[PDB]
Amino acid sequence: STGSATTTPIDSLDDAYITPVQIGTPAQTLNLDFDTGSSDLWVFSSETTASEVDGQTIYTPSKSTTAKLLSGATWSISYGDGSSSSGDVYTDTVSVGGLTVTGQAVESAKKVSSSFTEDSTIDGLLGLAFSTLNTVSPTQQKTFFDNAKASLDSPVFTADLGYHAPGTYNFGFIDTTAYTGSITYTAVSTKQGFWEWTSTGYAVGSGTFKSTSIDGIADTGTTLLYLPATVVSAYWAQVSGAKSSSSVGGYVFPCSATLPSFTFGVGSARIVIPGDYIDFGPISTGSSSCFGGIQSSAGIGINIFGDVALKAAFVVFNGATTPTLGFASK
């Protein structure tokens, strides 16, 4: 089997991407944030504290003839940006782009933090990291990809995120028309539950390539590119007037600037992030100070190849017995 679904930026800055997901019988369609940095499929629901729902589409398990309460199971998760959610668990039928999993754990939110409430466009998350990170207790549950894997034509999914435009998540096949040149594959460590890999270095604009190992995660659920402070300083030094602002919470730059590109290494191959991808617009409405898309990972504890990086590539998440990651230009 295979599946194919379009993923759509939630706003004009590509702050996140939503993908429609069919849950239950009859289908209840929710727009979920596909997140290769976590491993829980959780949704806004009829159980969510009413004051914490503000415009989201909810899952109502009592209206699904295939929903079954997973007795005694609870979940609770906290993300790197400080947001959180928690609740109980149903199993139900879940389909993405034509690909169907029966008995998928659908984690029903009883509580969500303010950032989730305030984002009316995201109805929940669909985790695509390794199932070892799944938070359901006392019986850990598998991701949608993990459940679908054996049935897929090939045990892979691909992320093809757009810049200020829709893109595609495919399951079970590699669309050879979706990228240019060849796909370069690189080793993955699953030791922390992530799609963790080592970039071979970077370049700023038309500058020379710096060969240096950068360990980080491929994370579709993180907006920006978080890299070591040395790397980030070298980038923003090429932008007149750019500075790190503790009050804003990262590097800002004059909105009048033309940003240089940023290149990262995948083995001997090179992925180029156009400068425009690194612009996240005014820090507040009407400001001439703009927020940067490349930020320091210092104090995160891990480097993150978030959407800023991934949307510059066609990315293969290979879930073979020994997982790997593939990157192609497009």
The CA-to-CA distance between both ends of the chain, in Å, stands at 25
Angstrom CA distances, 239 to 102, 224, 275, 283, stand at 51, 18, 11, 17
- 161 and 225 inside one domain: no
CA distance 142 to 169: 19
- 244 and 261 inside one domain: yes
Last residue within a domain, chosen from 155, 174, 193: 174
Q: Which residue has the tokens 């390539």?
A: 209
Ordered DSSP codes for 191-236:
TTSS-EEEEEEEEETTSPPEEEEEEEEE-TT--SEEE-HHHHHHHH
Q: Which residue has the tokens 């491993």?
A: 39
Domain that holds residue 260: 175-330
Residue pair 138/178 in contact (Cβ under 8 Å)? The answer is no
CA distance 258 to 240: 9
- 147 and 288 inside one domain: no
Residue pair 219/304 in contact (Cβ under 8 Å)? The answer is yes
70's CB contacts (< 8 A; 6+ apart) are: 88, 89, 90, 91, 105, 136, 139, 141
CATH number for position 329: 2.40.70.10
- 170 and 180 inside one domain: no
Q: Within 10 A of 46 (CB to CB), how many other CB atoms are there?
A: 13
DSSP-derived 3-state class of residue 182:
coil
CA distance 108 to 227: 34
The DSSP letter of residue 183 is: P
- 15 and 114 inside one domain: yes
Among 39, 86, 108, 199, the active-site one is: 199
CA distance 95 to 89: 17
- 83 and 217 inside one domain: no
Kindly report the length of the chain.
330
Give Cα 78 to chain centroid, integer Å: 15
CA distance 246 to 232: 15
Report the alpha-carbon angle 219-222-226, nearest 5: 85
The answer to whether residue 219 is catalytic is: no
251's CB contacts (< 8 A; 6+ apart) are: 232, 236, 242, 243, 244, 245, 291, 292, 294, 295, 296
Torsion of CA 93, 95, 100, 105, to 10 degrees: -40
- 125 and 244 inside one domain: no
Last residue within a domain, chosen from 174, 189, 221: 174
Q: Which two tokens stand for residue 17?
A: 């991407």
- 296 and 284 inside one domain: yes
CA distance 237 to 234: 5
- 157 and 142 inside one domain: yes
273's CB contacts (< 8 A; 6+ apart) are: 225, 261, 262, 263, 264, 308, 309, 312
Q: How many domains does the chain have?
A: 2
Q: In angstroms, what is the resolution?
A: 1.5
Phi-psi region of 181 (alpha: psi -120 to 50; beta: other; left: phi over 0): left
- 84 and 190 inside one domain: no
Last residue within a domain, chosen from 174, 209, 225: 174
- 158 and 185 inside one domain: no
Residue pair 281/253 in contact (Cβ under 8 Å)? The answer is no
- 107 and 190 inside one domain: no
Please choose, from the candidates 94, 107, 93, the residue with its C-alpha nearest in 3D space to the C-alpha of residue 42. 107
Omega cis (within 30) before 228: no
Please choose, from the candidates 119, 90, 99, 93, the residue with its C-alpha nearest in 3D space to the C-alpha of residue 31. 119
Q: Which two tokens stand for residue 122?
A: 């995201």
Among 14, 33, 35, 40, the active-site one is: 35
The answer to whether residue 11 is catalytic is: no
Please choose, from the candidates 307, 296, 310, 291, the residue with its C-alpha nearest in 3D space to the C-alpha of residue 235. 296
